Design a protein around this nucleic acid. Structure first.
Ligand SMILES: Nc1nc2c(ncn2[C@@H]2O[C@H](COP(=O)(O)OP(=O)(O)OP(=O)(O)O)[C@@H](O)[C@H]2O)c(=O)[nH]1
Lengths: 175, 73, 72, 70, 843, 79
RNA sequence: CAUCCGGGUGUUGUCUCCAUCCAUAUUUUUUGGAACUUUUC
């Protein structure tokens, strides 16, 4: 967005970086009779496809495209419901015998579930600090509890005063 | 059991068979039927010799076993 | 298709005459009708005949010694 | 144990069997066994005098089994 | 040669089995095999290959301390920076590997990593062209969808054996946290779903056509793989095999004896859950939840496994992966299952025969090579070919042919290139080869120049052998490009560089079409946004070093009509009258579907070389087609269909026969172009009504007169038949959460087409399957609108199947409707607006 | 057992063997068994006499085999 | 291009605390078709 002088609506905006926007040359390739017109060509498209809509990119980085879309279920009211509980959200859907003694190997124990376990499963899907039980110490000033909050959309409810603050915080981070 | 048989592994052996022929070479693999696998083999039919290579004998065919030399480094 | 023991089951019902060859002995053969048998291929022949064509005249054979069982 | 052998590709085809006592037989392969007992139809001996018979060969005996035509 | 090898050998990262045994194995035709890997987005494909790679190689050079342990999946075959940074496989990279199986007989396997993004289906087609069989990887959560149906349909259509892999099982248990009872059910549903689209064959976790895995974590299961490895030791071997038949569907064992009865007595479960899923869950629960001391006892007790304390001193995820890879050993369940699932005799004649006429003659003793994809490796462009027959060696002089030429089918016919080198692909390295043998797929240096895209490679020493030989048919890519970009360089003086680059792009990307306009502008066609974006990146970075101007995304339009002719020669001796007719949508669909007319399937017009009685039988049978008209079908166009229809056909048929090819050549010529925009024509049938011929034809009826005359007549007919414009439409596959539905509905409305063909609850997950349709001209940016409006939740794929051009709203030929520049066209007319902007470009 | 797997691994290569019959057979091996059945092609037999012959396809019984002779690279194989 | 606040590793000297693999007598291997004779070189 910086490189291309096209900020996202949420996003911070800088000066141009590349100075000259001077050449606006009418031409057969370009001409309005020749072009076919539908669609905004919003700035977001330019960022998403920096080598498609955004003609003549420079110092541009290739953007990550698409993560698998994660349907994780987390329960935040009653802990009593077990670890493996079909939720409301999920959509509806005379020959040879061997000694009785032989059985599934692991299942000497009666139940897979553990009181401890339910929390453990939740932890698996957690951020950098928690999902590792081994860590090197770091200084107090180093930690940035503040940081994540700006790194997220402001949301509709907030007054302009905080929405501006969100953008300003991002700008510092980006630089 | 077969505790003794693992001890023979990777030694040059002299194996007499029911035919009378005698094979010679190291022992790579061994079985519950006494199937032997032997490396760089040589029969001695008897003033005679032949070069075969890798030989896999059955249990039916084998009579006796005897170490020729110690295990090679 | 036709499995081997189902084929021998037909020779019981039809009472067909069948000549039996031996394992390590081509000089000898046998004959007779088949009354019964078992899982180990032992056979109870009736009016069995030992066959130069020297035809010499109810017996039971061990399954280890058979080679061929042939109709008529 | 009891590995049911790969004789599916020989079914309903001519054969040239060899058995113990250097005796051999031609026939159409009808059925086979765990122990390799065989069912042959249109059985012809090979003495060189070839006698038509019409046969269940034992498994133990069998040395080998060939194909006349590719 | 030896010197080259010695330097080369150092580069490659060596392996446990060694090349020599892997090289040694090659000679047997039966030994070894070819397998391709396909599946929809991020199904795991690449990482599955990565599993095999990490099993095989001791070093590995590339791995970070971080990645080896856990968190970042190591990527092999993503050796392209673009792919890495983009994060999705784009261009297929082979891996060749000597693999063992349960029997212990190793075979050499050629693996192909194909891209699962819908825009790179072309890549999948290229892989399929070579592979014997295909592994189709399905996400347990996602389930199956339209692209899966498409993939299996094509795979089976081309007689590619299919083995299923249900991946990300851990996610079903860890992400959704499903109960074992329900987990089984969900799996069963998925299994059912695959089977219904498949015809004539029926799988089941008991036929070993379905594999259960977690690529991420590190494991693969077949119900056979498990039984031998752990259960087998416990019980007599004779009985066990049966155990597997008594493992899947409706079987419960109470206490040594298992009865098909529902669950009489107290605590009950069907077996799959009893002996498989439950302990698997315990593993998950036990490893994370359990005290690390407790776990050791179970490993020795249940598995005979002994861990050091350093294996405990990790963290939940890396620990878990270690344990799963610890317990479940090298992925030979997979290999074994593959091995015993393909029969050469059944498929092989059929698969070879389809690409080529059935034949067959002069088998053996002859070189034959199918060239599919070309590869932009570190050095130069390599050619990828399937060893159809014989043997290749370095410096061998080889004849080369290109398919369109082949389409055509002695001196002049044969160009040739010597084969400089042959290498065996291994993802990030190439293993040096002296010689290549029938069965295997290899990298060739220096055969590239002869062919763009596909070509067929043969060496024939025999005049009859040469006559027999049938050229490989042009690969049929799954989708049509449609998307249209106009290029010009920033500075016109640099044109030569652009030209070169464009040709290179055609070689590397099989779905790209480059056309040259009068103006010197370059029309580029590609499958979709992302596809084209990648092209442009490589173009500016990898190939040309030139900054270039790119236009506003458009689309190719198609011409048509809905319902008499008079005509005159430039030397007025000939006079032509031809009717133009709307075609039956059924007929159109039948034509669009490339087929042999197999089973009950309406015959594809390219089967016309068969007896006209048969051809006409199909028309009469499927359409109640007029018996004279059916008998009078002359040919298809480059598209639709030509019929003879008048009394003079009876009056002078011999005379008329003399002019068929001139007509025939012209029509492809005339229909390939068009009277409105010089664009190809769809859904139109033509019938010759009258043809006047010059008295005493003194070499008067020349091609110079009749070809253009015929062309003119076509154009007039179309115009008088009331022409229309057709616009291509995508199938919109959208996956979302239920409450995000209304958003999606609005988006559709806003775009223009606003059509949703179906909404299906995805049973087992909190998701909907939304199928719609969208006008390609209104598609620019559509995907990002979705992603942004749903706050990152859900996703979209656009795929061109069926290739149906819908009528563009407005009348084809009305002046009045349009409103000034820069305004999206009013709905009443999108046909008139579409023509003028295209009209101007033409001239 | 390993003495059987080595056999399965020499499928494809050319093999020599000896039977209770007394004759030796040489050819490409197609399929084997845990029993020690075999399935070979282009066989070149050589009996006690020295009599050579050709046999297109062959099946065997393991019981009848004395011993096999296997290619040299099959000693680096994993056990 | 520099500064500044920090981090890791090795090494050297120190300090405190502590020690100096299944069991099968009935067809593919381990409960035998073996035994025996004679001629040729
Ligand atoms: N949760 C989970 N995700 C998995 C697993 N296996 C693969 N994945 C997903 O696969 C992605 C990475 O796999 P890749 O192989 O890089 O992606 P891919 O399947 O090659 O995708 P394409 O390159 O588009 O074919 C991750 O984002 C995961 O979401 C698994 O066992 N569990």
């Amino acid at each position: 967005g910086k490189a291309l002088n096209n900020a996202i609506p949420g996003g911070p905006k800088f000066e141009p970086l590349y100075p000259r926007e001077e050449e606006e040359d009418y031409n057969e390739f370009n001409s309005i009779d020749r072009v076919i017109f539908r669609v905004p060509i919003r700035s977001e498209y330019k960022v998403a496809f920096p080598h498609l809509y955004n003609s003549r990119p420079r110092s541009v980085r290739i953007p990550w495209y698409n993560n698998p879309v994660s349907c994780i279920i987390q329960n935040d009211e009653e802990y009593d419901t077990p670890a493996l509980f079909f939720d409301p959200s999920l959509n509806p859907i005379g020959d040879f015998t061997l000694p009785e003694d032989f059985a599934p190997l692991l299942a000497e124990e009666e139940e897979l579930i553990l009181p401890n376990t339910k929390d453990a499963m939740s932890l698996y899907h957690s951020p950098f600090p928690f999902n590792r039980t081994k860590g090197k110490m770091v200084r107090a000033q180093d930690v940035a509890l503040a940081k994540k909050w700006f790194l997220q959309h402001p949301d509709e409810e907030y007054p302009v005063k905080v929405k501006v603050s969100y953008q300003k915080l991002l700008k510092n981070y980006v630089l | 059991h077969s505790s003794r048989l693992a001890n023979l592994i990777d030694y040059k052996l002299r194996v007499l068979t029911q035919d009378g022929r005698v094979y010679i070479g190291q022992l790579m693999a061994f079985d519950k039927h006494m199937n032997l696998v032997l490396n760089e083999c040589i029969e001695e039919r008897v003033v005679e010799k032949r070069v075969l290579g890798l030989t896999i004998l059955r249990g039916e065919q084998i009579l006796s076993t005897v170490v020729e030399d110690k295990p090679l480094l | 298709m036709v499995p081997p023991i189902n084929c021998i089951f037909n020779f019981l019902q039809q009472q067909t005459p069948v000549t039996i060859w031996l394992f390590e002995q081509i000089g000898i053969r046998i004959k007779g009708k088949i009354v019964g048998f078992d899982e180990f291929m032992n056979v109870v022949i009736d009016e069995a005949v030992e066959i130069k064509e020297d035809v010499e005249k109810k017996i039971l054979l061990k399954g280890d010694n058979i080679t061929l069982i042939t109709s008529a | 144990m009891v590995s049911t052998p790969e004789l599916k590709k020989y079914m309903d085809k001519k054969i040239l069997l060899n058995i113990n006592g250097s005796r051999k037989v031609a026939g159409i392969l009808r059925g086979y066994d765990i122990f390799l007992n065989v069912v042959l139809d249109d059985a012809m001996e090979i003495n060189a005098n070839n006698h038509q018979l019409g046969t269940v060969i034992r498994g133990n005996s069998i040395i080998s089994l060939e194909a006349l035509d590719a | 040669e030896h010197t080259i090898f010695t330097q080369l050998k150092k580069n490659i990262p060596k392996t446990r089995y060694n090349r020599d045994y892997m090289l040694s194995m090659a000679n047997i035709p039966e030994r070894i095999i070819n397998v391709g890997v396909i599946g929809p987005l991020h199904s795991g494909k690449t990482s599955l290959m990565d599993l095999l790679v990490i099993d095989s190689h001791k070093r590995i050079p590339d791995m970070s301390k971080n990645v080896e342990l856990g968190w970042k999946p190591l990527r092999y075959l993503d050796n392209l920076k673009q792919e890495i940074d983009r994060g999705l496989s784009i261009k297929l990279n082979g891996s060749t590997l000597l693999c063992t199986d349960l029997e212990s007989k190793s075979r050499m396997i050629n693996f192909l990593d194909a891209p699962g993004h819908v825009n790179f289906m072309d890549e999948t087609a290229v892989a399929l062209a070579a592979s014997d069989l295909v592994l189709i990887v399905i996400d347990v959560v996602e389930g199956v969808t339209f692209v899966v149906e498409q993939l299996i349909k094509q795979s089976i259509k081309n007689n590619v054996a299919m083995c299923f892999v249900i991946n990300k099982l851990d996610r079903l248990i860890l992400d959704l946290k499903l109960p074992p009872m329900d987990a089984y059910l969900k799996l069963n549903h998925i299994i059912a779903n695959i089977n219904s689209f498949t015809k004539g064959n029926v799988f089941s976790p008991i036929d070993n056509n379905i594999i259960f895995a977690s690529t991420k974590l590190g494991f693969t299961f077949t119900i056979k793989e498990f039984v031998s490895y752990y259960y087998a030791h416990s019980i007599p071997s004779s009985k066990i095999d049966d155990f597997t038949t008594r493992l899947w569907g409706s079987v419960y064992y109470h206490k040594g004896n298992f009865r098909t009865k529902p669950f009489e007595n107290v605590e009950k479960y069907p077996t799959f859950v009893e002996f498989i899923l439950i302990p698997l869950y315990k593993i998950f629960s036990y490893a994370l939840s359990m005290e690390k001391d407790k776990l050791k006892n179970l490993l020795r007790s249940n598995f005979r496994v002994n861990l050091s304390q350093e294996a405990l001193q990790y963290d939940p995820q890396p620990f878990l992966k270690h344990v799963l890879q610890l317990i479940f050993r090298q992925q030979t369940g997979l290999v074994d299952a593959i091995t015993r699932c393909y029969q050469p005799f059944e498929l092989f004649d059929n698969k070879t025969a389809h690409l080529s006429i059935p034949g067959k003659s002069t088998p053996e003793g002859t070189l034959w090579a199918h060239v599919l994809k070309t590869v932009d490796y570190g050095g130069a462009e390599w050619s990828l070919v399937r060893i159809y027959s014989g043997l290749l060696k370095r410096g061998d002089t080889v004849r080369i042919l290109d398919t369109s030429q082949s389409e055509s089918r002695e001196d002049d016919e044969t160009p040739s290139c010597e084969v400089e080198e042959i290498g065996l692909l291994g993802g990030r390295y190439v293993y040096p080869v002296h010689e290549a043998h029938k069965g295997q797929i290899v990298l060739i240096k220096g055969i590239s120049s002869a062919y763009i895209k596909s070509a067929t490679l043969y060496s024939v020493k025999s005049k009859e052998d040469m006559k027999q030989l049938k050229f490989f048919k042009p690969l049929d890519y799954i989708t049509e490009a449609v998307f249209k970009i106009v290029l010009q360089p920033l500075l016109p003086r640099e044109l030569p560089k652009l030209l070169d680059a464009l040709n290179k792009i055609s070689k590397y990307y099989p779905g790209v079409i480059i056309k040259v306009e009068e103006s010197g502008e370059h029309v580029i066609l590609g499958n979709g946004e992302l596809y084209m974006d990648c092209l442009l990146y490589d173009l500016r970075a990898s190939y040309a070093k030139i900054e270039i101007k790119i236009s506003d995304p458009l689309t190719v339009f198609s011409e048509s009509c809905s319902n008499s002719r008079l005509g005159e020669e430039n030397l007025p001796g000939l006079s032509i009258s031809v009717a133009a007719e709307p075609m039956d949508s059924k007929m159109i669909q039948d034509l669009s579907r490339n087929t042999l007319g197999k089973g009950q399937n309406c015959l594809d017009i390219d089967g016309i070389m068969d007896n006209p009685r048969k051809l006409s039988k199909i028309l009469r049978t499927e359409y109640g087609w007029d018996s004279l008209a059916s008998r009078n079908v002359w040919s298809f166009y480059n598209g639709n269909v030509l019929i003879n229809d008048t009394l003079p056909d009876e009056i002078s048929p011999e005379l008329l026969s003399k002019y068929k090819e001139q007509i025939i050549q012209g029509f492809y010529w005339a229909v390939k172009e068009g009277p409105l925009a010089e664009e190809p024509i769809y859904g139109v049938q033509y019938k010759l009504l009258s043809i006047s011929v010059p008295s005493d034809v003194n070499i008067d009826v020349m091609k110079s007169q009749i070809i253009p005359l015929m062309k003119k007549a076509c154009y007039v007919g179309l115009l008088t038949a009331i022409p229309i414009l057709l616009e291509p439409i995508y199938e919109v596959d959208i996956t979302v959460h239920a409450p995000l539905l209304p958003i999606v509905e609005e988006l559709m409305k806003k775009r223009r087409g606003s059509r949703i063909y179906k909404t299906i609850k995805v049973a087992g997950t909190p998701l909907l399957e939304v199928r719609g349709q969208v006008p390609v001209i209104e598609s620019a940016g559509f995907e990002t609108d979705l992603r942004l409006s749903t706050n990152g939740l859900g996703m979209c794929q656009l795929y061109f199947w069926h290739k149906i051009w819908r009528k563009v709203p407005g009348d084809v030929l009305d002046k009045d409707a349009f409103i000034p520049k820069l305004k999206p066209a009013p709905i009443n007319s999108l046909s008139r607006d579409f023509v003028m902007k295209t009209r101007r470009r033409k001239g | 057992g390993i003495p059987v797997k080595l056999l399965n691994e020499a499928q494809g290569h050319i093999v020599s063997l000896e039977l209770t019959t007394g004759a030796t057979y040489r050819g490409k091996l197609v399929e084997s068994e845990d029993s020690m059945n075999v399935q070979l092609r282009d066989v070149i037999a050589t009996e006690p006499q020295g009599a050579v012959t050709h046999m297109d396809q062959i099946f065997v019984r393991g019981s009848q085999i004395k011993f096999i002779v296997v290619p040299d690279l099959l000693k680096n194989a994993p056990l």
